[PDB]
Amino acid sequence: HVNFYRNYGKTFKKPRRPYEKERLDAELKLVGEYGLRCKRELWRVQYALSRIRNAARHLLTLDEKNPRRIFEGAALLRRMNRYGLLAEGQDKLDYVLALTAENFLARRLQTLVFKAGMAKSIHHARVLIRQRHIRVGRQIVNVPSFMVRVESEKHIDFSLTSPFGGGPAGRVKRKNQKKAS
Amino acid sequence: LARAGKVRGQTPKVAKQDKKKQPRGRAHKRIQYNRRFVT
Amino acid sequence: ARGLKKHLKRLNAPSHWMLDKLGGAFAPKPSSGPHKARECLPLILILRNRLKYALTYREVQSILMQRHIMVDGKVRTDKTYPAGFMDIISIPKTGENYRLLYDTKGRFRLHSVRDEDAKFKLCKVRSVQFGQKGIPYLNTYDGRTIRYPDPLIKANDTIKLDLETNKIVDFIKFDVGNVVMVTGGRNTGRVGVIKNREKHKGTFETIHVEDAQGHQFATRLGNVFTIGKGTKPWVSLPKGKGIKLTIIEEQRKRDAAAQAA
Amino acid sequence: GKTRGMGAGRKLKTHRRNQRWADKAYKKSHLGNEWKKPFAGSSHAKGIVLEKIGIEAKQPNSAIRKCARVQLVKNGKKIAAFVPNDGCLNFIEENDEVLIAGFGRKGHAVGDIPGVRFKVVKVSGVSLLALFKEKKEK
Amino acid sequence: AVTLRTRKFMTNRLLSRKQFVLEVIHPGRANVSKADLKERLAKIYEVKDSNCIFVFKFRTHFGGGKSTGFGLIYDNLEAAKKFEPKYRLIRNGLATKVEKSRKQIKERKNRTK
RNA sequence: UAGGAUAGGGGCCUACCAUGGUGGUGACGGGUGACGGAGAAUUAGGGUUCGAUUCCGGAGAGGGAGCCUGAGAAACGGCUACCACAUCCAAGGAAGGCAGCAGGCGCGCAAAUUACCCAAUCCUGACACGGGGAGGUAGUGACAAUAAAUAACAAUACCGGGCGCAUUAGUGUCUGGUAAUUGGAAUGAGUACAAUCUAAAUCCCUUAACGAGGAUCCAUUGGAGGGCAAGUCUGGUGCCAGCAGCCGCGGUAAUUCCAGCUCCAAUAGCGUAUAUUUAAGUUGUUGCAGUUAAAAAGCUCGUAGUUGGACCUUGGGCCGG
Ligand SMILES: [Mg+2]
Ligand SMILES: [Mg+2]
Ligand SMILES: [Mg+2]
Ligand SMILES: [Mg+2]
Ligand SMILES: [Mg+2]
Ligand SMILES: [Mg+2]
Ligand SMILES: [Mg+2]
Ligand SMILES: [Mg+2]
Ligand SMILES: [Mg+2]
């Protein structure tokens, strides 16, 4: 039975010590600031960040002039600079350890919407993403964790079909107008 | 064995209210946020 | 088992067939033919997957029994024919010739040729030795056999075979200093001029090769395939002149590709 | 102390092999007696109740913990099995079919109950929690 | 007010057809029927026969407004008859279908003579 | 050694001769809830446990044994015999083998459909063309994995902290909550013309008119003494019933039981149970311990094992970056 062979794995790991005021408050801080649906969402980011940091660490164990090191470091910094997670002149493979979950929650399309305006609230931003309202280039993205890249940031905008800036109004508008006329 | 269920039967029966739903999902964490350390 | 295994499931199909993992359970299972079925490419993988002349199994069946496809100059109705190295595929409906050549990554390419550089093919000899009544004959790695071979032709050498007179036209003596195109292992694809050949009593004799741009490697005598005498090969090499280049350089070439676009 | 010779790999592997046995958990898993225990290497085990019995509680406490002697239909053993909750014992009845789960502590008796390792989680194929919380009655 | 473009287009005079992957863009429109695409493809390729077209595998990408798929333009309806799978012909109605009941499709009938 | 037999080497077998082969570096035997492997979980490194399973190799068709056809079978969707089991019988006989797909009995903690199709992947035939329970599709599916709804924004309001002065005010700024508050917005869950999908249907992705007032389109699972985040709340019970993984609660002011309000944790998941990995430097090669806590043999000799003192020219260099 092929369709058996399709891989799939996990995206997070629950924290070891379930109940600590300090970690629990730090998690509530991040979930409050970046308007998350639950702390599974926070917990994915640390998993991805831990994977990349471990990738960096294994490289930094080796020495320069090692072809693996040059290639994978170049690739890793390309990946980060494409998502706007490391800045200019900061292409060093040591500032890729210093990145923290602030930086990944900084790129979720909720955050990009709210910081581009167009939301008036970050919790408004999440829902506005989910009611098919914002495209990226020409496709609507209804995922609050879309991780918009820098060569895509310049042109997040409303739909051609959403009521706010696209075409037809919503069903409540059309109800109000139909019972007004 | 004659005492099985003793307190379970002793306790009076009391009924709930119709507490308004506290919103689940995102809005619940919104309330936890702006109730704990925005208040 | 109690007999021959006639199905080959998709994940057992060799790495250089490039065929995807989830397209189905099975793989074309090349018929017992002129090439070793581990170092081959079936005609369905030629038509369907690469050239897209068909889109299914049956459509390649239609292609082949239209009698359109030619191998080594004679029409072929088989659909798991184990074509191999320097087999020529002509499609006279399209007047179009391919010669099946490796690239440096170990995969097959279809390098086009004209008709003058298609009238003949090129293959090495497995062994030359006697037969009935004492007539010498040689056996290639292509399955082909030649009777009354040119008494200089030895084992490991290479020959050209015209597809009309069907005999030798020339032969290159396997020797130091002429170019090869290794056909097995990690070094397969990389052309280059022998600089040394060391023999060991009781096992494989290895060949040291250099890519004409400097890089040097070695491979046992099995997978070398001398193309041309000296530096000049007698066959039109593929798009990248048989140079395997580091992954770093495959990055620089794509950077240089995009920065001029 | 230790043999750190370079050629003493055999000596050290044999030593660890012989001494891994003085560890209780390893000896318990690789001696086989889980397969002479009543579940015989099972998670749960279904059975039939012979009588609701009731057993005293250890000295610091004082009680009558209401247990049921059940018989295992997979291997014929008879055991005791707690009926955990207030008043919930009455739903159990003699010759009702009950699933005997582990009671906790990984095969060793728990709490103030002397000599009981097993809890009843189902009777007549209906959740014993369900009857306690009146979700679904048998 | 819809558009129509093709790509990955190759002509193989082996199977005497021109085969393409079309990339229809229909903003506003729910989707376009394959029949409704037939006349547009026919009038942009002047195939002389709007029955030589067989188009399929349409998607309508997430978010709507753009659909892909494959297309097959034949050059003789004779070749359309012969080089075609049996079901696209039935989709265009060029042939009809029957049903099966396989009790003694072959089993009991392998017993008598 | 001589020969037989085999496709072929061979004690594979025979005749004769020799008495050898293995073993503390564990033979032989015994256990395995043991098919082997690629690999799976956990992993700071080292490791520990697992591996029926879709890829490869082997083995097996109820248990054994023996064979014909054939290139290939000691074949079971072939036969012959025996043992176990069982079917039809007109009472003579005859036919058997689901560890194939589906299903039924039973066993058990524990496992879906007596569906559709050859359209895809490949095989097979005398063969473009038939067949394919291989295989694919639809159905049950909280095994596991992914994304992800259950509301958002506003001003009124009893309010509640700066900030306009801070004095002495008062209200005012992010809107914090109780607001079935008041209000127009947005939408998909669901329904539904269609189209597309499909071998044919279907899921999906698209979308005409429907589809929201917070009671509803309603989110639960476990707790609130510590470990462990969160009640010196209120009634009942009285070392009873019961909780409690451990410590402990309960003998009339119970934060632990049983309940109501409140809160906490995770949240479409969460507990329980067993096996197992980490914790565990409590298996310690990396890396434990042996005066008194568990633990130096009474003492010496000792064979295999383990371990073994120093010494022998690349000693000074030109050379090219
Ligand atoms: Mg088999
Ligand atoms: Mg074949
Ligand atoms: Mg005690
Ligand atoms: Mg002999
Ligand atoms: Mg076994
Ligand atoms: Mg197998
Ligand atoms: Mg059986
Ligand atoms: Mg067999
Ligand atoms: Mg047999």
Ligand SMILES: [Mg+2]
């Ligand atoms: Mg059978």
Ligand SMILES: [Mg+2]
């Ligand atoms: Mg079955």
Ligand SMILES: [Mg+2]
């Ligand atoms: Mg409780």
Ligand SMILES: [Mg+2]
């Ligand atoms: Mg309580």
Ligand SMILES: [Mg+2]
């Ligand atoms: Mg506690």
Ligand SMILES: [Mg+2]
């Ligand atoms: Mg606490």
Ligand SMILES: [Mg+2]
């Ligand atoms: Mg508990």
Ligand SMILES: [Mg+2]
């Ligand atoms: Mg408690």
Ligand SMILES: [Mg+2]
């Ligand atoms: Mg221990």
Ligand SMILES: [Mg+2]
């Ligand atoms: Mg222990």
Ligand SMILES: [Mg+2]
């Ligand atoms: Mg110790």
Ligand SMILES: [Mg+2]
């Ligand atoms: Mg002592």
Ligand SMILES: [Mg+2]
């Ligand atoms: Mg000694």
